[PDB]
Design a protein around this ligand. Structure first.
Ligand SMILES: CCCCCCCCCCCCCCCCCC(=O)OC[C@H](COP(=O)([O-])OCC(O)COP(=O)([O-])OC[C@@H](COC(=O)CCCCCCCCCCCCCCCCC)OC(=O)CCCCCCCCCCCCCCCCC)OC(=O)CCCCCCCCCCCCCCCCC
Ligand SMILES: CCCCCCCCCCCCCCCCCC(=O)OC[C@H](COP(=O)([O-])OCC(O)COP(=O)([O-])OC[C@@H](COC(=O)CCCCCCCCCCCCCCCCC)OC(=O)CCCCCCCCCCCCCCCCC)OC(=O)CCCCCCCCCCCCCCCCC
Ligand SMILES: CCCCCCCCCCCCCCCCCC(=O)OC[C@H](COP(=O)([O-])OCC[N+](C)(C)C)OC(=O)CCCCCCCCCCCCCCCCC
Ligand SMILES: CCCCCCCCCCCCCCCCCC(=O)OC[C@H](COP(=O)([O-])OCC[N+](C)(C)C)OC(=O)CCCCCCCCCCCCCCCCC
Ligand SMILES: CCCCCCCCCCCCCCCCCC(=O)OC[C@H](COP(=O)([O-])OCC[N+](C)(C)C)OC(=O)CCCCCCCCCCCCCCCCC
Ligand SMILES: CCCCCCCCCCCCCCCCCC(=O)OC[C@H](COP(=O)(O)OCCN)OC(=O)CCCCCCCCCCCCCCCCC
Ligand SMILES: CCCCCCCCCCCCCCCCCC(=O)OC[C@H](COP(=O)(O)OCCN)OC(=O)CCCCCCCCCCCCCCCCC
Ligand SMILES: CCCCCCCCCCCCCCCCCC(=O)OC[C@H](COP(=O)(O)OCCN)OC(=O)CCCCCCCCCCCCCCCCC
Ligand SMILES: Nc1nc2c(ncn2[C@@H]2O[C@H](COP(=O)(O)OP(=O)(O)OP(=O)(O)O)[C@@H](O)[C@H]2O)c(=O)[nH]1
Ligand SMILES: [Mg+2]
Lengths: 119, 458, 60, 53, 97, 320, 346
């Protein structure tokens, strides 16, 4: 991570993160973060003792848009870190066969797992 | 999954509705959501009903959710005795807590992950202490919140460390995966503490003899809505947990069970004997709940097919009746403005129908046949007797006391001679009588075909 | 006398819950009760330094 | 009416330490303005004896 | 070498001197000031020894901020000496609570 | 948009706006001594703003429509009850003084805010520096308990410390026998219920404490009763006054910035008037607090923020 | 004068940023003074005897830690000859640094300064001290986490959690208990620091956001004592409602976002075979939960007697806008379902 080769510091979504499928606008994680924008909208009028459901909708609309915007790139970075974590992981096992052997998976007919009577 | 979204959908329901329609609108949609919940006992065979990656149901959960979804209307009309004088926002926020509570219990039972279960399992606490402390009546309701929550976390937190440990070792804790990828528990000293950590969290939310000080310290002072929901489903959250977590705790369960089931065995006689000597009416059902709740502790510990069925049968049946006796506690308490048992006596000559509800409540808690209380208790006896022959002399001696205090409350309150100086009891409204009816009828008419209630092992 | 008063109301509630409640209560006082003198604070920082690198010797 | 806290219950956690002891029994909760009042005047201008030499 | 030993134990007693207040803050403040003199001499000893030309930088630049720390230090002591009059750390406890 | 730290950076100064006639002046006198008239004449003569003596509902005058709200909703204290039965067990005496102190405290803050903002001089009847004397007269008559005095001097020292004395203070000297004649002529039935010892007690604590310590803090003008009617004469002295004695001259723009920021944040202004001292009279119980506050809510123009209440008629709410 | 107070606040931010962007051991120290130089003025902005009290107490410990921090670097120079920010090559020097940085953070018995200073200074400066200076030492600890002594840092972390949360239920001033609560949160992030640095940042961010949300709420309520906060229910009951919601958030009960670090911290520690240590810190975190509810008990969940003059406060309204308050509250309570975002930090 903080030391992987070919990394540009302070660089957000890089030139290969775009190879992954983008999160959909109907992403359940994304809309929930939009719901946090909706929640952060209504509470604002509570401190300022304003109608919590029918006050200035410009604040509420701007509260939701900001959350849904910054979330989308975070949700893009979300998968890219996991994809990068998954990518290098599979290269290591391929490059180090001796640390990850394949046991000859044998059926339960041969397995001597003992029986515990409960009574 | 089709239950949760409408359950969340009641959150805007109550919070927006007109000043006088909040309870009407909340009452109906809680009654309508019992439809979609009632389609959850609708079940396939031995395979569980898995309808989503994160949510699943089986014959053990199915009675539970239909209990909670049914339950919320009961606390809705129950709270319509003392919330009338409160402000609208406080009234709306009371529904918010109850609806938020539903959203949790409706989701713990459907959780297919141990941590997701645990996250929501202890998440139900946050709505509770709001109910007990904010809307409580007496003075020591403040001490009620500390006793309830600290007892719960002191056992729940080591379970969280245990769960992540299992996550790292075997790889996953999905309720199916651990069942299929089972592994016997070695007698290593480390496994003993892991077993203890896994079980202790559900023990504290399963009043054990010694880990039960919060039972009389929470139910008595809690509001009426909080009292039944904490006694009817909240105590069962551990019951669901132990039935599930025991799949990975064998064979260490059988050898390690002796310190625990026996403490439940001896205390369940003791706790029932406590009810024989009581001064507070609401303390009767609290302590009676402890003895009944501790009965299934033995059943789950034996891990016997009959015991599990009896545990589930008693689990729902006790929750229904324990909630009922709390409603009858409320009506008498509201009329007399006191919780003392010996104060209000001879109430049957004034409220004949209320006496009949008292009769049915105490007699069902007495666990006569064919009531679900008896069939659940009888299955436990047979399983316990197979485990050991002496078990009958103890758990049978509980039924000795169980019949006593059940009739003791009936005799001293309804029967006898009325106290003359009480000039407060009016005729009972149609609310409580319907509230009692909505408690008694589902229990009785479930008796014809209780096989939705026995559980997955049926 | 034995079931309710002795065990539940007295013994069972004084063994586990109130003891730990008192254990935190018994000596949380001077945890918060400090004289406020810079002398006592910085003298304590001295001992923490010596115990770290000389007595228990995390380096060694 | 449900029991609401009274004045006496308010004084429980109302002192400098809600959990007091003899060591802190003589303490004094901080002033609400968070400013201690000025103490005794501390001017000590020295006296210079000009003259007669 | 032995010269290094002499001036790191200069730190040690300076370390002991700083976090040991007896009567007044001024003596401790001076000990904090003099504490960097060993720090100056310490850092200076390696840098001429090792002939690293650039890092002759830091002995002077350590002197910029160490004495600047003292500069705000004794100027803070001015604020004490008006409200408190004296400069005693024993009296310096009005936040007992 | 009101003057904050941003305005100071942009260029909004306040020592530029003030002028020679930028004086805040308080008139003082005994009970119904006619000083309120003198405040009016000096205000209009030099073009100074007049602030009437702050009553129980003065806070109601600066909030909403400026009309006196219900006493039970705006203090639960009546000056008439203070007049009729001073030793009432409910404790209306300290409820009068403590509430009136904050009303004067709000009066003083608004007067200084106007003086610091526009620079046009402000004249108000009495002040917080003249408020302690009324309570001192009360304690000197058995009117009040000593713990009430301790609470009042605590909050007064806490709240009035960072404020500055007013530019000029002018007092009219009317003797007690003359004062008794004036109130008797008034005919308001509540003000026969007075004590001559109380009237000398309030008079004594003026000239013994108020005027002495106020002298070194700002200029004092002791004025005779007959001289007061000559509204022409009383104003020439205040016109050509030294206006140098006190902390008013040594006041830079930065300390003026702190003063304006304090007075403009009205909640802070009387924030410490609600000290958690749990006096038996001062404290209002929880159920009363909720019900009275719950009452305050549906009063028109109170449920939401100003300019946002539908019952008032505020439109454009969905985009306000 | 406000224009200058922007500059010293900027320099404190600039000095902190200098620490977290410097690759030279020298410049890392330079940022600490840049923080230290301009901190004392904003610490005694109100100019109270308590302000001078706290300012002097802050300076003595902080100057000692920074001064101890050089020859920790200098012995590294003696035995490595490297100025670059990497793992340390001499053990005794780096053990010396760990004490120095713990002094800045206030973890060990070194922690005595932070609760003392927080009370004397105002709430606004208390927030800045308690939410901004917890980054510069964190950055240095994050960098040198390679060769960090496990026993040394774990012992420091345990004590910071223990005394941090044990004396918390003994202070009636809110500014004190948060300093006490912060030391407990200081221990939580520092305990994971030797094992995995990523979860330290997440716990830092989660603790920081809650630190604003509470301190920012406190300024709006203008409270100094628990009784003073208790009176808030009679003016803005909603504000007192978010009060308790944040308390349970800082307690760590799900779904509230305060369960974020406690859930994430014990994960890799159990992965790292450290299991007894996670159990103890979790159980003693209930000490934090105790005085959290007690403040919630006195503020929101129950009423409290009010004063007569309190009624007039209803007539007037607050003038401070108190920017970014609603976002902090939501970001401090409803965040748990978005857990995988720790990868974004990673
Ligand atoms: C991470 C994700 C979560 C966090 C995201 C960020 C949240 C930021 C919240 C900021 C809230 C600021 C606020 O309202 O403070 C009020 C509060 C003062 O409240 P007050 O005492 O009622 O105000 C009286 C006036 O300030 C009296 O004012 P005055 O007359 O003395 O003049 C001074 C005035 C001058 O202002 C101007 O000139 C403009 O400046 C101020 O008042 C303080 C603000 C200065 C800002 C300077 C910015 C430079 C760039 O000020 C502060 O708390 C300042 C603290 C330092 C800056 C904010 C840093 C917060 C975040 C730190 C951690 C960041 C993330 C790390 C990871
Ligand atoms: C980069 C992309 C993502 C961020 C986009 C940010 C767009 C807005 C930029 C300005 C801003 O954020 O100001 C915040 C700042 C917050 O002050 P405030 O007083 O707390 O805001 C409430 C007021 O009612 C606000 O003032 P008001 O009551 O007059 O309402 C009108 C106000 C409306 O202002 C607002 O609605 C304030 C901004 C709300 C959103 C702020 C960003 C939230 C954080 C980003 C998302 C974080 C996601 C975290 C969750 C996932 C974590 C994994 O209009 C504007 O601010 C004009 C348009 C923006 C310039 O507002 C201003 O500077 C303007 C006042
Ligand atoms: C929901 C619960 C979890 C919430 C977590 C916090 C979410 C809100 C804050 C996200 C933005 C702040 C962190 C990321 C950022 O802006 O820059 C990170 C970094 C900043 O640059 P950097 O990575 O050189 O510096 C940070 C160093 N680490 C990663 C160790 C913390 O930007 C990146 O794009 C990272 C690239 C390198 C990754 C390795
Ligand atoms: C004998 C019993 C007669 C019952 C008559 C209706 C009264 C009780 C109705 C309760 C609601 C039951 C709803 C249910 O189970 O599924 C509804 C269902 C559930 O949603 P659904 O219709 O999307 O279900 C999907 C499955 N198929 C496509 C097969 C229908 O909804 C409707 O029927 C509309
Ligand atoms: C003959 C004779 O007596 O026949 C009786 C009859 C027949 O009973 P049966 O048991 O013979 O069933 C026969 C079924 N067939 C005909 C298909 C073979 O009784 C009934 O039909 C009803 C029996 C009870 C079934 C369960 C009802 C549960 C309803 C719960 C409502 C409330 C839910 C929420 C609260 C409770 C949550 C757990
Ligand atoms: C009071 C707080 C608790 C104090 C006592 C703590 C006991 C810890 C016991 C423990 O860690 O046992 C080891 C066991 C597995 O250890 P392992 O990760 O395999 O390491 C190698 C050795 N087996 O660890 C595990 O299996 C982890 C699961 C259990 C974690 C909690 C410890 C037991 C329950 C304690 C509370 C009981 C109430
Ligand atoms: C979980 C949330 C609730 C937890 C319990 C809160 C404390 C107990 C409940 C009573 C609190 C006191 C009170 O007055 O509650 C009502 C209050 C709004 O009261 P009022 O000002 O009359 O509303 C006007 C609306 N136009 O409104 C509130 O108190 C609102 C509480 C909101 C809490 C945060 C919710 C975040 C999102 C989830
Ligand atoms: C196995 C799993 C189940 C375990 C169940 C038993 C343990 C449950 C948790 C501890 C007990 C909590 C009881 C409820 C709180 C209580 O009793 O508080 C009492 C008291 C209340 O305060 P007050 O009314 O002023 O009375 C002071 C009297 N000296 O307050 C006090 O006296 C102070 C109480 C401080 C301790 C309680 C909070 C922390 C709980 C965990 C402590 C241990 C942490 C790990 C080490
Ligand atoms: N306790 C108290 N009573 C006040 C205060 N201001 C006025 N009063 C009462 O007001 C009543 C009338 O006396 P004053 O207000 O002094 O004078 P007035 O009758 O308005 O006449 P002028 O002095 O000419 O303005 C008396 O009952 C006073 O005690 C005050 O600040 N506190
Ligand atoms: Mg008058």
């Amino acid at each position: 991570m903080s030391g992987r080769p070919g990394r540009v510091p302070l660089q957000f979504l890089p030139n290969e993160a775009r190879s992954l499928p983008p999160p959909k606008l109907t992403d359940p994680r994304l809309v929930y973060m939009g719901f946090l924008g909706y929640c952060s909208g209504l509470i604002d009028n509570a401190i300022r003792r304003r109608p919590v459901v029918s006050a200035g909708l410009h604040r509420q609309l701007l509260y939701v848009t900001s959350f849904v915007f910054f979330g989308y790139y975070l949700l893009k970075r979300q998968d890219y870190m996991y994809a990068l974590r998954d990518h290098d992981m599979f290269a290591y096992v391929k490059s180090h066969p001796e640390d990850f052997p394949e046991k000859d998976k044998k059926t339960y007919g041969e397995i001597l797992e003992e029986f515990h009577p409960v009574r | 999954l089709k239950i949760i979204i409408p359950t969340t959908m009641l959150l805007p329901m109550t919070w927006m509705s007109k000043h006088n329609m909040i309870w009407i609108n909340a009452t109906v949609h809680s009654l309508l959501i019992s439809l979609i919940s009632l389609s959850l006992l609708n079940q396939l065979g031995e395979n569980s009903l898995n309808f989503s990656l994160t949510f699943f149901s089986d014959s053990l959960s199915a009675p539970l959710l239909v209990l909670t979804t049914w339950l919320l209307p009961l606390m809705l009309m129950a709270s319509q005795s003392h919330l009338s004088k409160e402000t609208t926002t406080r009234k709306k926020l009371y529904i918010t807590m109850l609806i938020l509570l539903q959203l949790f219990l409706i989701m713990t039972f459907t959780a297919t992950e141990l941590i997701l279960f645990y996250i929501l399992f202890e998440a139900t606490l946050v709505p509770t202490l709001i109910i007990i402390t904010r809307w409580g009546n007496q003075t020591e309701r403040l001490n009620a919140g500390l006793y309830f929550l600290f007892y719960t976390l002191a056992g729940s937190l080591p379970l969280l460390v245990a769960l992540v440990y299992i996550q790292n070792t075997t790889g996953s804790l999905n309720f199916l995966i651990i069942h299929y990828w089972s592994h016997p528990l070695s007698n290593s000293w480390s496994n003993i503490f892991m077993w203890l950590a896994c079980i202790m969290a559900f023990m504290v939310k399963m009043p054990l003899y010694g880990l039960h000080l919060w039972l009389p310290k929470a139910h008595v002072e809690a509001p009426i809505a909080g009292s039944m929901v904490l006694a009817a489903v909240l105590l069962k959250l551990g019951g669901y947990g132990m039935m599930r977590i025991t799949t990975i705790l064998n064979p260490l369960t059988n050898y390690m069970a002796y310190p625990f089931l026996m403490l439940s065995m001896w205390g369940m006689i003791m706790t029932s004997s406590i009810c024989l000597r009581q001064t507070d009416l609401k303390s009767l059902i609290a302590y009676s709940s402890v003895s009944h709740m501790a009965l299934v502790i033995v059943a789950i510990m034996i891990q016997t097919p009959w015991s599990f069925m009896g545990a589930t049968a008693l689990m729902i049946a006790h929750g229904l009746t324990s909630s009922m006796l709390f409603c009858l506690a409320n009506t008498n308490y509201e009329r007399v403005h006191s919780r003392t048992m010996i104060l209000a006596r001879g109430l049957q000559t004034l409220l004949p129908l209320m006496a009949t509800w008292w009769l049915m409540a105490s007699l069902t808690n007495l666990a006569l046949p064919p009531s679900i209380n008896l069939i659940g208790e009888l299955f436990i006896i047979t399983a316990s007797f197979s485990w050991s022959n002496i078990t009958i002399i103890l758990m049978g001696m509980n039924m000795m006391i169980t019949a006593l205090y059940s009739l003791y409350m009936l005799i001293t309150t309804q029967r006898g001679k009325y106290t003359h100086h009480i000039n407060n009891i009016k005729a009972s409204f149609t609310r409580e009588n319907a509230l009692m009816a909505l408690h008694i009828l589902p229990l009785l008419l479930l008796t014809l075909n209780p096989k939705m209630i026995l559980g997955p092992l049926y | 006398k034995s079931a309710s008063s002795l065990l539940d109301l007295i013994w069972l509630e004084t063994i586990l819950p109130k003891t730990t409640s008192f254990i935190q209560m018994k000596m949380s006082i001077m945890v918060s009760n400090q004289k406020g003198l810079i002398k006592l604070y910085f003298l304590s920082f001295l001992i923490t330094i010596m115990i770290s690198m000389t007595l228990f010797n995390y380096h060694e | 009416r449900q029991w609401q806290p009274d004045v006496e219950w308010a004084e429980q956690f109302g002192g400098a330490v809600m959990y007091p002891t003899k060591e802190t029994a003589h303490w004094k909760p901080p002033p609400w303005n968070d400013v201690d009042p000025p103490k005794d005047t501390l001017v000590s201008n020295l006296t210079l004896n000009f003259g007669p030499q | 070498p032995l010269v290094y030993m002499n001036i790191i134990m200069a730190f040690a007693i300076a370390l002991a001197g700083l976090l040991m207040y007896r009567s007044h803050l001024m003596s401790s403040l001076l000990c904090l000031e003099g504490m960097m003199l060993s720090l100056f001499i310490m850092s200076t000893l390696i840098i001429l020894n090792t002939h690293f030309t650039l890092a002759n930088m830091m002995p002077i630049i350590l002197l910029v901020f160490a004495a600047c720390e003292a500069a705000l230090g004794l100027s803070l002591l001015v604020m004490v000496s008006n409200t408190y009059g004296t400069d005693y750390v024993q009296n310096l406890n009005l936040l007992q609570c | 948009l009101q003057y904050g730290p941003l305005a100071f950076v942009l260029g909004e100064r306040t020592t530029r706006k003030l002028t020679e006639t930028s004086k805040v002046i308080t008139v003082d006198g005994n009970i119904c001594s006619g000083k309120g008239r003198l405040a009016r004449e000096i205000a209009e003569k030099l073009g100074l703003r007049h602030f009437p003596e702050a009553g129980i509902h003065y806070a109601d005058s600066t909030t909403g429509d400026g009309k006196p709200l219900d006493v039970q909703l705006s203090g639960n204290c009546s000056l008439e009850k203070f007049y009729d039965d001073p030793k009432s067990n409910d404790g209306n005496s300290y409820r009068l003084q403590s509430w009136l102190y904050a009303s004067r405290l709000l009066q003083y803050a608004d007067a200084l805010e106007h003086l610091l903002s526009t620079g046009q001089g402000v004249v108000l009847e009495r002040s917080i520096y003249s408020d302690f004397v009324f309570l001192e007269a009360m304690y000197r008559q058995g009117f009040i308990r000593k713990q009430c005095v301790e609470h009042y001097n605590e909050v007064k020292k806490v709240t009035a410390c960072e404020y500055l004395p007013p530019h000029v203070v002018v007092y009219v000297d009317v003797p007690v026998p003359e004062i008794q004649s004036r109130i008797q002529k008034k005919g308001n039935p509540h003000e026969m219920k007075i004590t001559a010892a109380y009237l000398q007690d309030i008079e004594n604590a003026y000239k013994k404490t108020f005027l002495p310590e106020m002298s070194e803090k700002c200029e004092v003008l002791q004025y005779s009763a007959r001289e007061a009617e000559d509204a022409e004469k009383v104003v020439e002295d205040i016109e050509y006054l030294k206006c140098d004695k006190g902390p008013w001259p040594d006041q830079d723009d930065r300390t003026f910035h702190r003063l304006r920021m304090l007075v403009q944040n009205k909640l802070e202004v009387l924030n410490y008037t609600t000290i958690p001292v749990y006096l038996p009279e001062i404290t209002i119980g929880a159920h009363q607090s909720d019900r009275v506050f719950q009452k305050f809510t549906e009063l028109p123009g109170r449920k939401y923020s100003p300019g946002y209440n539908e019952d008032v008629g505020d439109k454009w709410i969905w985009l306000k | 004068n406000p224009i200058i107070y922007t500059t010293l606040i900027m320099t404190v931010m600039s000095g902190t940023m200098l620490v977290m962007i410097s690759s030279h051991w020298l410049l890392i120290w330079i940022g600490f003074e840049m923080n230290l130089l301009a901190m004392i003025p904003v610490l005694m902005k109100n100019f109270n005897p308590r302000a001078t009290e706290a300012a002097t107490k802050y300076f003595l410990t902080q100057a000692t830690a920074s001064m101890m921090l050089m020859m920790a670097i200098i012995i590294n120079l003696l035995y490595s000859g490297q100025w670059t920010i990497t793992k340390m090559f001499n053990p005794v020097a780096m053990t010396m640094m760990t004490m120095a940085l713990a002094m800045k953070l206030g973890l060990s018995p070194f922690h005595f300064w932070v609760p003392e200073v927080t009370q004397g200074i105002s709430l606004q400066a208390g927030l800045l001290l308690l939410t901004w200076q917890k980054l510069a030492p964190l950055s240095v600890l994050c960098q040198i986490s390679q060769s960090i002594n496990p026993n040394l840092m774990l012992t420091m972390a345990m004590l910071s959690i223990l005394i941090g949360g044990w004396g918390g239920l003994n202070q009636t001033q809110l500014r004190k208990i948060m300093a006490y609560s912060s030391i407990a949160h200081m221990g939580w992030m520092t305990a994971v620091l030797p094992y995995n640095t990523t979860m330290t940042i997440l716990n830092l961010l989660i603790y920081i956001t809650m630190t604003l949300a509470m301190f920012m709420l406190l300024i709006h309520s203008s409270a100094t004592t628990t009784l003073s906060l208790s009176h808030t229910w009679n003016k803005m009951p909603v504000i007192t409602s978010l009060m308790m919601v944040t308390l349970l958030s800082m307690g760590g009960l799900p779904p509230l976002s305060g369960f974020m670090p406690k859930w994430m911290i014990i994960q890799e520690m159990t992965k790292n075979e450290s299991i007894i240590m996670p159990t103890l810190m979790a159980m003693t975190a209930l000490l934090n939960l105790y005085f959290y509810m007690r403040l919630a008990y006195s503020s929101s969940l129950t009423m409290f007697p009010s004063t007569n003059n309190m009624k007039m406060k209803w007539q007037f309204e607050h003038t401070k806008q108190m920017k970014l308050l609603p976002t902090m509250i939501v970001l401090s309570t409803l965040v748990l379902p978005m857990t995988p975002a720790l990868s974004s930090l990673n």
